[PDB]
């Protein structure tokens, strides 16, 4: 039986790092198949030097890691798969080194063959916060580079439309980027997470944009935004994250179409918008009902005394008097430990990765 | 008993 480790010479250490971070393609056929080979490649190198009681190699891959990944990104960052492909590498290696830490409180879905791939020699605790403040950073990247693809996108898929962009625009690319963090073994809590931060800058950027137009205020798009958040809710059904927190973040614009759509003339009707809109601030509720355009004839503005009462009712909020979402929030990010159940003792390294200075162990 | 192998800032 193999023992689940990978010997390399100190000499080839910058080639082991040139090939397996600096150089490698994350769309390539070979990295497929195994999700988070780069990470299984490196820990069992780690387990390598660990057991060879050497300290001193030890250190020297785990910070040549660290520096290179942060190569790749200051390189190559505003590509979402090369991103992707890192954050899910840098998890997958912390999670490594929490599953064979040799720490009881990691080990519970380890097989009895898992356990005895512990490490022996080294706490490597301390890495592990490096590592993990690594990975926070990558998200952040992350977050910002989705951003950027998804912001031309947003206004004209969420509130104008009834080189171009509709709602199937921003839906094909958020299958893009799940089928991509999918294929990458991004860890599925993360996804969550990702999925969560994007629906919430979709919801911030369409809100801001019809507080800022005066064409947005109607009861017909009410009903259009009420269609364009249904459609969102239904690809997190069908991707199966509708415990991500995702729709949630989408309560302001939610409320603020509801708010289109309701009376607005009653005492009764100020005390419904009241009791409905808590996750609206003062100046956005005003806002909405001094924009609001009637549909014909049969319908009318809504009355500066009726706005009076609105703000008479809500006077004792704990009120943010600001107007706008602020659409750059990032909520923090966890990574939870999510051992696997690949066994480090069949991993086979491709031929086509250029490794073969490596040897099985 | 494993040893702690230490990281700060000058490893990197």
């Not at chain 1, 190569?71 to 492909?85: A, C, H, N, P, Q």
């Not at chain 1, 509709?166 to 089928?179: A, G, K, M, P, V």
């Not at chain 1, 009653?266 to 419904?272: G, I, K, L, S, V």
Request: glycine share 4%; proline share 3%; charged share 25%.
């Amino acid at each position: 039986d193999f023992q689940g480790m990978l010997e390399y010479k100190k000499e080839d250490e910058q080639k082991l790092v040139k090939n397996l971070i600096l150089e490698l393609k994350p769309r390539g056929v070979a990295v497929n198949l195994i999700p988070g080979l780069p990470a299984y490649i490196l820990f069992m190198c780690v387990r390598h030097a660990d057991y060879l009681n050497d300290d001193q190699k030890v250190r020297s891959l785990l910070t040549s890691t660290i520096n290179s990944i942060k190569k790749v990104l200051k390189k190559r960052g505003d590509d979402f798969e090369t991103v992707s492909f890192w954050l899910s590498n840098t998890c997958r290696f912390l999670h490594c080194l929490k599953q064979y830490s040799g720490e009881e409180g990691f080990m519970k879905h380890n097989t009895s063959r898992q356990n005895e791939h512990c490490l022996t020699n080294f706490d490597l605790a301390e890495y592990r916060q490096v590592l993990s403040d690594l990975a926070i950073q990558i998200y952040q990247q992350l977050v910002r580079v989705l951003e950027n693809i998804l912001q031309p996108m947003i206004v004209s898929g969420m509130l104008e439309h009834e080189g171009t962009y509709t709602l199937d625009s921003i839906l094909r690319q958020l299958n893009s980027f799940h089928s991509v963090m999918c294929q990458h073994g991004m860890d599925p809590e993360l996804i969550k997470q990702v999925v969560k931060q994007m629906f919430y800058i979709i919801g911030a950027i369409t809100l801001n944009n019809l507080l800022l137009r005066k064409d947005m205020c109607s009861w017909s798009k009410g009903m259009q935004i009420r269609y364009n958040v249904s459609q969102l809710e239904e690809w997190l059904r069908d991707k199966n994250l509708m415990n991500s927190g995702a729709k949630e973040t989408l309560e302001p614009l939610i409320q603020a179409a509801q708010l289109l759509q309701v009376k607005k003339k009653t005492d009764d009707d100020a005390e419904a918008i009241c009791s409905m809109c808590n996750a609206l601030t003062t100046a956005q509720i005003v806002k909405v009902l001094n924009l609001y355009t009637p549909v014909n004839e049969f319908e009318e503005r809504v009355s500066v005394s009726f706005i009076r009462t609105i703000q008479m009712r809500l006077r004792d909020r704990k009120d943010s008097p600001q107007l706008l979402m602020d659409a750059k929030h990032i909520f923090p990010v966890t990574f939870p430990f999510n051992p696997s159940s690949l066994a480090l003792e069949t991993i086979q390294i491709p031929a086509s990765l250029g490794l073969g200075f490596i040897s099985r162990v | 008993k494993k040893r702690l192998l230490s990281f700060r800032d000058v490893d990197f």
